[PDB]
Design a protein around this ligand. Structure first.
Ligand SMILES: *[C@@H]1O[C@H](CO)[C@@H](O[C@@H]2O[C@H](CO)[C@@H](O[C@@H]3O[C@H](CO[C@H]4O[C@H](CO)[C@@H](O)[C@H](O[C@H]5O[C@H](CO)[C@@H](O)[C@H](O)[C@@H]5O[C@H]5O[C@H](CO)[C@@H](O)[C@H](O)[C@@H]5O)[C@@H]4O)[C@@H](O)[C@H](O[C@H]4O[C@H](CO)[C@@H](O)[C@H](O)[C@@H]4O)[C@@H]3O)[C@H](O)[C@H]2NC(C)=O)[C@H](O)[C@H]1NC(C)=O
Ligand SMILES: *[C@@H]1O[C@H](CO)[C@@H](O[C@@H]2O[C@H](CO)[C@@H](O[C@@H]3O[C@H](CO[C@H]4O[C@H](CO)[C@@H](O)[C@H](O[C@H]5O[C@H](CO)[C@@H](O)[C@H](O)[C@@H]5O[C@H]5O[C@H](CO)[C@@H](O)[C@H](O)[C@@H]5O)[C@@H]4O)[C@@H](O)[C@H](O[C@H]4O[C@H](CO)[C@@H](O)[C@H](O)[C@@H]4O)[C@@H]3O)[C@H](O)[C@H]2NC(C)=O)[C@H](O)[C@H]1NC(C)=O
Ligand SMILES: *[C@@H]1O[C@H](CO)[C@@H](O[C@@H]2O[C@H](CO)[C@@H](O[C@@H]3O[C@H](CO[C@H]4O[C@H](CO)[C@@H](O)[C@H](O[C@H]5O[C@H](CO)[C@@H](O)[C@H](O)[C@@H]5O[C@H]5O[C@H](CO)[C@@H](O)[C@H](O)[C@@H]5O)[C@@H]4O)[C@@H](O)[C@H](O[C@H]4O[C@H](CO)[C@@H](O)[C@H](O)[C@@H]4O)[C@@H]3O)[C@H](O)[C@H]2NC(C)=O)[C@H](O)[C@H]1NC(C)=O
Ligand SMILES: *[C@@H]1O[C@H](CO)[C@@H](O[C@@H]2O[C@H](CO)[C@@H](O[C@@H]3O[C@H](CO[C@H]4O[C@H](CO)[C@@H](O)[C@H](O[C@H]5O[C@H](CO)[C@@H](O)[C@H](O)[C@@H]5O[C@H]5O[C@H](CO)[C@@H](O)[C@H](O)[C@@H]5O)[C@@H]4O)[C@@H](O)[C@H](O[C@H]4O[C@H](CO)[C@@H](O)[C@H](O)[C@@H]4O)[C@@H]3O)[C@H](O)[C@H]2NC(C)=O)[C@H](O)[C@H]1NC(C)=O
Ligand SMILES: CC(=O)[C@H]1CC[C@H]2[C@@H]3CC[C@@H]4C[C@H](O)CC[C@]4(C)[C@H]3CC[C@]12C
Ligand SMILES: *[C@@H]1O[C@H](CO)[C@@H](O)[C@H](O)[C@H]1NC(C)=O
Ligand SMILES: *[C@@H]1O[C@H](CO)[C@@H](O)[C@H](O)[C@H]1NC(C)=O
Lengths: 332, 125, 265, 184, 124, 125, 124
């Protein structure tokens, strides 16, 4: 152990953390490698998602080469503070941290080559702008943009270590409301006023499951429409009964359209759900206007009034049924 | 615990197709990820592919990539493996495995807790 | 590398972080430069907005000049702790932080001149008093007031580095409920009891989109009015029917006026 | 690397000193040896409220300033400039309140561990009624007027007049509950 | 922008009273604080007092303290200055100024962005 | 992916006006920012201006400033470029480009992922 | 401000009982804690006991402990002091005091802002 300690001290002696490898020379190739642990949350209201991952970085610092020893050296996490590490950050993160219990969750593994393996366990909540136009038959593209803060392409280069196999754990992701249909890795160089920087983009495509919404929105709407149509099977002389059917179904439809809109962000466009609820509103308000009209002609034109009821009993459900078939097909 | 049982293995001619099935019972929720491994007579256990609990995300070996597809149907607690454009290299006993939620990497057989008595697939050229 | 390390050590040797450039002499011109990443949120209830930005500062410290080297030196973020940096703060912030993952998000780029480029990635939630009189056909003026905490105009001066082109990213801002109609940069000197300090003001004008409210307030109201008027098309003898129309529409109108008022301050 | 007074806020629940871009603290020295130590602080301090007259009430919120360890034998406090020691009361803009006056006080309080210096900043907050006439009073007043419509229907309209009775009675309990939900 | 216009200045005898008015128009919300300054012929610009957007909180100069009161009526976008027990020392051109939300100290004229052409008050 | 197509370019006399259009299709949401570039025969690619997804905020080059206006109509997935008081200096092939949400600075052409085959604008004095 | 007035003091024989009352008016909410002090002719001010705004929690001096009880009735803005099994040592002028919400320790008289003109209790 003493020999190893001496070698480590020699490696540290004169090591300047301020200077990258090949300070004046070519850029440092940094290899990125990600193992996803989980996506803990996806907020449509805040348009972000919370990710948990093992973020590994590989580079070569010749100042950390050792000839004598024949094995790879795993050192205590506290060595990071006395080494140069890339200034890698997540461009589109809102709040991220590195886990601290029981010790700071960071790994350093050295090789006689001078190659460094720097692992971090990170949880990020990153921005994911959402196109809720087709909601809840939508899908989203959430990304994690990885870039260096200060060092330009003249000083740092990025690459996905292992190409398409550089990210793992997409298969582990378990979300109640979504499912990861595919993922993509990209490598680019982006140009700011301060210079050109390297970027890597991890992407997911989230397909939303409809299960939650058929229970909490669609069935209530569909059954509140069917409920409104019961008033067609009462004689027009039951004025108070048929107004209850009309008013209650009309009011319980607005409160659905409001309560459904309360779980979303305050977007200015209309969602596929908003149209569905809107049409449902039409069928319920029409069911009332129909009764109001029938009542208005019950002595003026009693023949017509009785015919309207007998037609409505068949037109309404058929139209509502065919509307559904068109609606679902348009969005599937 | 979990019990896995396979089916659909048989003799197929080269360039042919075949569909393997793996029916699961018991605590399927505690072992969400499912994997496919194959064992040739001479070679070591090879990773074929694996699928998520949601069924959306998959992962395949390079050799098997673009010629095989893994699908799920949680309604029937069954994962399927469709093997198209089969080669004689694919000849092996195909196994079906289930992995714990926090069991580490997909590629490694050690991590999988439950397996099923494999089905033979032979490919004549 | 060893030569560069030695030069850096020489630059540090005798450097006092307590003293600004030209300590007794003229003030230090500091150039500000902002690149907006996003406005993440705008709260009418808390009268604040959350901003994310790259905050760059440029000044000249002659103690950091190097003749021998012909290129600009990007140093590790940890050098900030052993240099003098301006005591710049955001006057109207409620809670701000500097991103820490994977390393503290700060950049230092040196020039042989002695010029320093100090970049920080910051998210602020800053106060934005709102005039909701014309709500929801209103628009607001949210600002970010930049000033030095301790150093007066005798010691520090501010300027927007590049004038009107000093801020970027207003075009990147994507808010569900608002849209940025214009922005303005200003430079002023404000006078406190402790002295006169330099200030820079970044301003946005937020025009609210009505889409959300026609769905959640206006249509319910408009249709609840139309619903009340159905009772006119029933004969006067239908007393109970026409009282249902009256009572229900009256009660569902108060609950709209209450529920609409619940999303505001 | 200097001695600073151990000044704290007795009635704070959670306070911090702003950190961006640098810690918001100023030191200005004079050849005299006089120190000016400025801090930018946000405190959330306790303000026990007498809601008996709510919402026509007013409250007295304070900020009690004291030294933690040093007694009057070691520290003394005074409002530098007397009544002119506090500024910015005029800047305060609250949607629901308005600052009618403020007061500065200097006292010495006695604990078991000794006598310590204290300074008390006080505000008097007068509540505006605008919010409550919209969300409580008008609904109540109109729900009463609505109940009285049933007097203008003939007594034979039994179901009509029970609707007026029941609905107005139930919508009154839900107001009394929903109004009580925004309070402690 | 904001436009301020004053009125009510005139000749008054010592110990008398007078009420100055200042009507505001435009972006009154962006410049919430209002201040009163006076300029004697010989002396420099003097701070009289100032009032908050809510109208509750005020602040007065020591000389003017206890003899003047500033009030607000946001219904009419107007601030008032009632000057009672007037002295010949009070003789000056009284100005009305509007201050930005984050403009620093009240006492200093520099901070105020908008002013109004003052009204003369003379005390014999 | 995104497809951009322009129109409205032609011959115009100096001091004249002209309106260029750029119709977009496909994943327009993933590339929210739109930019205008022009290429004279001899000179390098020049930045003209750019517009936000909301359509509110814009940015123009100094040369083109006060004589051109960029507008959006997301109803028709189209951005417009109105060029008034045209100079012979403005003669060039005007291109329409779309930029990713996180693609860095507007001024730089490298960042834009999708372009459209440009339209010619010539200005005779 | 607050005004405190006491009553119920008089002559009592040893081992007897007596009930002192203290009626409060004004800003009673800003001075929630109430204390009882007694002053013998020769001795210094002695702490008797004190009671909370809620009326639940109390605190008594050792000498007075187990022979006296302090109670509250915020309905009448009044605190009571029942003194049972009285000794000649208890002879003194009993005072009623009100303490600010943040005024430090109960035992010390300095902290109490408002007092009432005491009532005499003599025990033969
Ligand atoms: C909540 O849910 C979690 C998971 O979602 C549950 O966790 C599971 O809990 C069970 C116990 O309830 C765990 O099983 C036991 O595993 C230990 C592990 O032993 C290790 O070391 C020994 C000794 O060196 C090795 O022999 C073991 O290697 C064998 O097993 C592993 C798999 O565990 C296998 O990969 C190896 O190839 C090897 O094979 C043996 O097991 C396979 C299994 O199919 C079998 O086919 C083969 O013939 C071999 O037997 C391993 O590295 C083990 O010691 C235990 O053994 C005891 O029970 C068995 C019978 O079950 C007896 O035969 C034996 O004598 C012992 O008494 C168990 O196997 C399981 O690992 C664990 N899973 C995870 C992912 O954590 C929780 O229990 C749930 N909790 C609640 C409350 O619901
Ligand atoms: C959101 O809301 C905030 C407020 O809440 C708005 O903020 C205001 O924004 C405007 C710009 O839109 C700012 O105005 C510009 O101010 C600068 C800086 O002014 C200072 O420095 C200059 C030195 O260059 C000094 O000369 C100034 O002193 C003069 O002006 C002040 C008032 O600013 C005045 O009190 C002094 O007596 C002195 O006088 C001159 O102005 C008066 C009129 O006020 C005039 O009568 C006299 O003849 C003198 O000219 C000061 O210390 C200033 O340089 C700019 O001037 C240029 O533009 C104006 C047009 O606006 C031209 O007239 C002029 O010739 C210049 O071209 C502007 O005045 C204002 O300061 C700022 N206020 C605060 C508190 O933030 C935001 O704009 C709003 N944003 C949105 C998006 O809505
Ligand atoms: C979620 O949403 C995001 C967007 O918001 C999606 O992200 C996009 O994903 C695609 C992949 O699916 C990315 O495309 C690929 O990009 C790489 C990298 O490109 C850079 O580096 C290479 C060097 O390695 C350079 O050569 C590239 O330069 C070329 O392209 C740039 C613009 O990208 C252009 O400005 C240059 O002039 C240069 O030109 C050539 O490309 C243009 C078209 O852009 C063409 O017209 C011209 O003729 C030239 O060929 C660049 O700097 C790139 O290597 C890949 O190329 C491969 O695929 C294409 C076909 O797609 C083949 O034709 C080619 O031969 C290669 O095989 C891709 O272009 C894209 O960059 C990325 N966008 C951003 C902003 O991140 C996610 O995919 C979405 N996720 C989900 C799940 O939906
Ligand atoms: C919000 O609510 C809080 C409390 O909940 C209010 O706080 C109170 O505010 C008032 C002022 O409005 C404070 O009273 C003033 O106290 C100061 C400081 O007192 C100390 O220091 C001075 C010297 O600086 C000493 O002289 C004082 O000593 C006297 O008082 C103590 C304590 O009562 C006593 O032990 C001593 O024997 C001595 O007694 C004198 O006062 C009592 C009062 O009843 C009187 O009976 C007796 O005869 C003595 O005169 C003490 O150590 C003090 O300087 C001020 O004096 C000035 O005003 C008074 C009139 O009010 C004049 O008489 C005097 O000449 C001075 O001009 C005040 O007494 C009070 O302490 C404070 N309490 C707390 C707990 O903070 C806020 O006001 C409320 N705010 C709003 C806006 O609602
Ligand atoms: C002529 C007739 O059969 C009457 C009976 C109910 C009436 C409707 C009731 C609801 C609306 C009331 C409004 O005042 C006018 C339009 C609306 C839509 C009315 C139009 C005329 C109708 C349909
Ligand atoms: C050190 O790690 C490399 C991979 O980085 C591995 O191939 C090698 O075998 C390791 N060294 C030893 C002695 O095992
Ligand atoms: C260093 O930065 C300056 C800006 O002051 C720039 O002009 C110069 O080209 C840069 N040097 C290099 C090596 O590019």
């Amino acid at each position: 152990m003493s020999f190893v300690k001496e070698t480590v001290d020699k490696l540290l002696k004169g090591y300047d953390i301020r200077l990258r490898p090949d300070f004046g020379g070519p850029p440092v190739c940094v290899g990125m490698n990600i193992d996803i642990a989980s996506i803990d949350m996806v907020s449509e209201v805040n348009m972000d998602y919370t990710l948990t991952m093992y973020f590994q970085q590989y580079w070569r610092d010749k100042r950390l080469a050792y000839s004598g020893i024949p094995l790879n050296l795993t050192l205590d996490n506290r060595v990071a503070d006395q080494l140069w590490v890339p200034d890698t950050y997540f461009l589109n993160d809102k709040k991220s941290f590195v886990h601290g219990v029981t010790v700071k969750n960071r790994m350093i593994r050295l090789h006689p080559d001078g190659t460094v393996l720097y692992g971090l366990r990170i949880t990020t909540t990153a921005a994911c702008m959402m196109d809720l136009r087709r909601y809840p038959l939508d899908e989203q593209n959430c990304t994690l943009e990885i870039e260096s803060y200060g060092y330009t392409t003249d000083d740092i280069e990025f690459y996905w270590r292992g190409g398409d196999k550089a990210v793992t754990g997409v298969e582990r992701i378990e979300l109640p409301q979504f499912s990861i249909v595919e993922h993509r890795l990209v490598s680019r160089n982006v140009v700011f006023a301060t210079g050109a920087y390297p970027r890597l983009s991890l992407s997911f495509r989230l397909k939303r499951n409809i299960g939650y919404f058929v229970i909490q929105t669609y069935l209530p709407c569909i059954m509140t429409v069917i409920l409104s149509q019961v008033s067609f099977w009462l004689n027009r002389e039951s004025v108070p009964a048929r107004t209850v059917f009309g008013v209650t179904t009309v009011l319980t439809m607005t409160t659905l359209s409001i309560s459904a809109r309360n779980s979303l962000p305050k977007v200015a466009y209309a969602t596929a759900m908003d149209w569905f609820i809107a049409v449902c509103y039409a069928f319920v308000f029409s069911a009332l206007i129909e009764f109001a009209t029938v009542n208005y002609f019950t002595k003026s034109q009693p023949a017509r009034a009785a015919k309207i009821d007998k037609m409505s009993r068949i037109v309404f459900p058929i139209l509502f049924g065919t509307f559904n078939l068109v609606y679902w097909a348009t969005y599937l | 615990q979990v019990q896995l049982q396979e089916s659909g293995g048989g003799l197929v001619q080269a360039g042919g197709s075949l569909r393997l099935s793996c029916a699961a019972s018991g605590h399927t929720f505690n072992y969400p990820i499912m994997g496919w491994f194959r064992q040739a007579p001479g070679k070591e256990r090879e990773f074929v592919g694996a699928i998520s609990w949601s069924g959306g995300s998959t992962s395949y070996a390079d050799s098997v990539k673009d010629r095989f597809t893994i699908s799920r149907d949680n309604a029937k607690n069954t994962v399927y493996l469709e093997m198209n454009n089969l080669k004689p290299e694919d000849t092996a006993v195909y196994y079906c495995a289930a992995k714990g939620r926090y069991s580490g990497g997909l590629y490694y057989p050690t991590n999988y807790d439950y397996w099923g008595q494999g089905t033979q697939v032979t490919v004549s050229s």
